[PDB]
Amino acid sequence: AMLSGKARAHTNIALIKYWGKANEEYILPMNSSLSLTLDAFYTETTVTFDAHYSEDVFILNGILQNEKQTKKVKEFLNLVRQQADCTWFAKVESQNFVPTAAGLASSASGLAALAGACNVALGLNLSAKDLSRLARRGSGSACRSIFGGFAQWNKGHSDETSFAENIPANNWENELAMLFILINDGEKDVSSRDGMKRTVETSSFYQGWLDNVEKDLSQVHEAIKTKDFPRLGEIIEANGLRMHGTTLGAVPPFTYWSPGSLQAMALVRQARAKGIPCYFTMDAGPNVKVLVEKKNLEALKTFLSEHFSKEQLVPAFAGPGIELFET
Amino acid sequence: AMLSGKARAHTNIALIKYWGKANEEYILPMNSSLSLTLDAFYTETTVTFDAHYSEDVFILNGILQNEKQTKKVKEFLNLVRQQADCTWFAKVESQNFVPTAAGLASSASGLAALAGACNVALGLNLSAKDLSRLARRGSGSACRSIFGGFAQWNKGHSDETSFAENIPANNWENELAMLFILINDGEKDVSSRDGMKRTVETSSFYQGWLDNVEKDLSQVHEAIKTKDFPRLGEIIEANGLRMHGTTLGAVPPFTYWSPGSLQAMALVRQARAKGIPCYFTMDAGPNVKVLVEKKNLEALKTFLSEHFSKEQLVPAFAGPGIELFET
Ligand SMILES: Nc1ncnc2c1ncn2[C@@H]1O[C@H](COP(=O)(O)OP(=O)(O)O)[C@@H](O)[C@H]1O
Numbered sequence: 265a266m267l268s269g270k271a272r273a274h275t276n277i278a279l280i281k282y283w284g285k286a287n288e289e290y291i292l293p294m295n296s297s298l299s300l301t302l303d304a305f306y307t308e309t310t311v312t313f314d315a316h317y318s319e320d321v322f323i324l325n326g327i328l329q330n331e332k333q334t335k336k337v338k339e340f341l342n343l344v345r346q347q348a349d350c351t352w353f354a355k356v357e358s359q360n361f362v363p364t365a366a367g368l369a370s371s372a373s374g375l376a377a378l379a380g381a382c383n384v385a386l387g388l389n390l391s392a393k394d395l396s397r398l399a400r401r402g403s404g405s406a407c408r409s410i411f412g413g414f415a416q417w418n419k420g421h422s423d424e425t426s427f428a429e430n431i432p433a434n435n436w437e438n439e440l441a442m443l444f445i446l447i448n449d450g451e452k453d454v455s456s457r458d459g460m461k462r463t464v465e466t467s468s469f470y471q472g473w474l475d476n477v478e479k480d481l482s483q484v485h486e487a488i489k490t491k492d493f494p495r496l497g498e499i500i501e502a503n504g505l506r507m508h509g510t511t512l513g514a515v516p517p518f519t520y521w522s523p524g525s526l527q528a529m530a531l532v533r534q535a536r537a538k539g540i541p542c543y544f545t546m547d548a549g550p551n552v553k554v555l556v557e558k559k560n561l562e563a564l565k566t567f568l569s570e571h572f573s574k575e576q577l578v579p580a581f582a583g584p585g586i587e588l589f590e591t
Numbered sequence: 592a593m594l595s596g597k598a599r600a601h602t603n604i605a606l607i608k609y610w611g612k613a614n615e616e617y618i619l620p621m622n623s624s625l626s627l628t629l630d631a632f633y634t635e636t637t638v639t640f641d642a643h644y645s646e647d648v649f650i651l652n653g654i655l656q657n658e659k660q661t662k663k664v665k666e667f668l669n670l671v672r673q674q675a676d677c678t679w680f681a682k683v684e685s686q687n688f689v690p691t692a693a694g695l696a697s698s699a700s701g702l703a704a705l706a707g708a709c710n711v712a713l714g715l716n717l718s719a720k721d722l723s724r725l726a727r728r729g730s731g732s733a734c735r736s737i738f739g740g741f742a743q744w745n746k747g748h749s750d751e752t753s754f755a756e757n758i759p760a761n762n763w764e765n766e767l768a769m770l771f772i773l774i775n776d777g778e779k780d781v782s783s784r785d786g787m788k789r790t791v792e793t794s795s796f797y798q799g800w801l802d803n804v805e806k807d808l809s810q811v812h813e814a815i816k817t818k819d820f821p822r823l824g825e826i827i828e829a830n831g832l833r834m835h836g837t838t839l840g841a842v843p844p845f846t847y848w849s850p851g852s853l854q855a856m857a858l859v860r861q862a863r864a865k866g867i868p869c870y871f872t873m874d875a876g877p878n879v880k881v882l883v884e885k886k887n888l889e890a891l892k893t894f895l896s897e898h899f900s901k902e903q904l905v906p907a908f909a910g911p912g913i914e915l916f917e918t
Pocket residue numbers: 307309324333336337358359360363364365366367368369370371372373374375378454455456457547548549
């Protein structure tokens with residue numbers, strides 16, 4: 265009496281950021297977002313539900329996770345169990361091919377892969393739409409890792425209408441790269457979930473953020489239609505800076521930046537001045553991600569090596585949607 | 592046929608920031624501000640108007656200033672000349688006992704000292720109120736260096752009503768210190784005047800800034816009434832962070848921070864966690880200024896020496912108002 269399943273999901277990086285929930289229970293976002301799924305980082309997860317298990321068990325990178333580290337996996341497992349009317353405890357075993365809790369979207373690949381493995385094991389036969397919707401309840405960003413290439417999370421207005429979808433771009437995404445500047449792969453002080461909740465509830469800058477998201481999304485859609493890389497870059501760099509500005513208006517204010525983050529952003533501006541078209545974005549952590557055309561990637565790498573070791577510069581290209589597996 | 596005068600003015604540091612002009616021509620501010628005048632940094636300036644001069648001449652730290660570097664001194668000189676109906680060119684010779692254009696308020700001490708020297712030479716006999724009003728037209732922050740200790744610039748609504756005044760604090764200001772962490776004493780890329788104009792005109796965060804200034808000013812007045820150092824510190828640290836957040840929402844966005852700025856702010860938070868009550872503020876530049884009680888100043892210095900050389904840590908205490916001199 266056991267049910268099992270397996271999934272691989274890749275990370276994605278938001279070009280237009282999700283920042284702040286309109287509904288915390290269902291993870292419905294205050295604004296829509298738009299991401300690129302990436303080939304270099306991903307999560308592989310298997311789940312076993314079994315009538316003979318005595319408790320939920322979560323093993324991550326071969327390490328048993330403690331109660332605090334398992335509380336959220338357990339919340340997700342409770343959701344999918346009530347959805348299927350399944351009364352069995354489960355065993356989640358996951359491997360992160362990505363640093364955990366470092367602002368590199370391990371929650372997106374991780375909860376997408378768990379949603380996909382649960383969907384298989386409990387035989388939910390979810391459409392891509394509905395798998396995105398379920399992943400969303402584990403981590404907002406996970407609903408976008410269901411898809412490859414460019415994807416857009418439409419905020420919708422309810423559990424039924426908030427989910428992601430692929431953005432066809434005439435394979436423009438295969439002409440692009442994202443170069444990761446790893447400043448610190450440690451676990452962040454302020455989780456994405458806690459930071460954005462603080463911003464929503466207290467930041468005096470949060471209305472400015474919201475007032476600009478839809479304009480940015482449109483500009484990105486028109487730049488994708490016209491394969492305008494500089495215009496894409498200018499929008500997403502400013503969107504990233506705008507999102508991080510909101511945390512300086514929170515009460516108390518905080519920042520995700522470290523000193524190396526600012527050094528890397530200044531260098532990206534220097535690369536641009538010396539003729540390398542490239543543009544930075546950041547997420548909830550100190551690492552800096554640089555959007556650049558494949559043409560210019562080794563150029564950028566060599567420029568950036570003047571201040572960063574080779575191990576600090578990880579390239580990534582467009583990646584695939586979720587892959588489900590029977591076991 | 593010559594008229595001469597001399598003045599010394601000290602810098603001040605804004606606890607509640609002036610950021611953005613409501614009237615650029617007269618330098619009337621969008622919000623009121625509150626500063627502490629400091630003993631360690633100052634400017635000494637002499638002016639000579641003389642019928643035999645053939646042009647305005649500005650010498651700063653013994654270096655002749657070129658046209659671009661003199662354009663603003665000339666604007667001020669034109670103002671005071673039209674005010675007095677004086678048709679003579681002038682010679683301004685100034686010494687900055689403070690780094691110039693580095694976010695350490697050289698414009699406040701510098702234009703205050705020029706206003707004071709012009710007032711003497713042309714025999715304007717200005718009250719403190721009216722000397723603050725004239726200094727204001729040279730640099731907003733200069734209207735506060737007319738006074739010592741705590742001072743408040745009331746935004747008013749016109750040239751007649753926008754000016755500063757001393758804030759009596761039962762000599763609380765003599766129990767305080769400001770420790771300067773010098774990250775870079777070079778001249779800034781984005782002048783205070785250009786940066787705040789960019790923020791006013793384009794930043795989506797500028798309304799959040801304005802919506803919080805008066806609350807902060809009141810909290811500072813109540814903390815001064817009750818000599819509540821931790822409450823003073825919490826307000827001014829957040830006010831500083833809020834002001835700098837506005838530049839990340841500008842179009843294009845920019846920051847005054849450098850990597851060392853973030854390192855210093857994180858250390859100040861570490862000093863606080865290890866039992867040293869202290870609080871950081873920043874102005875339009877990368878240097879970090881730390882408010883601390885005199886009791887705790889050597890403690891802070893020793894803590895900060897773990898990452899900064901002794902030459903990078905300049906203490907300053909409450910300072911005096913402007914001093915006028917006949918020549
Ligand atoms: N493979 C995984 N399976 C389950 N939960 C995961 C996995 N990887 C990460 N997480 C969860 O995501 C949290 C980090 O989320 P977040 O703060 O959004 O960081 P990140 O920037 O890596 O997404 C981890 O602390 C953990 O709770």
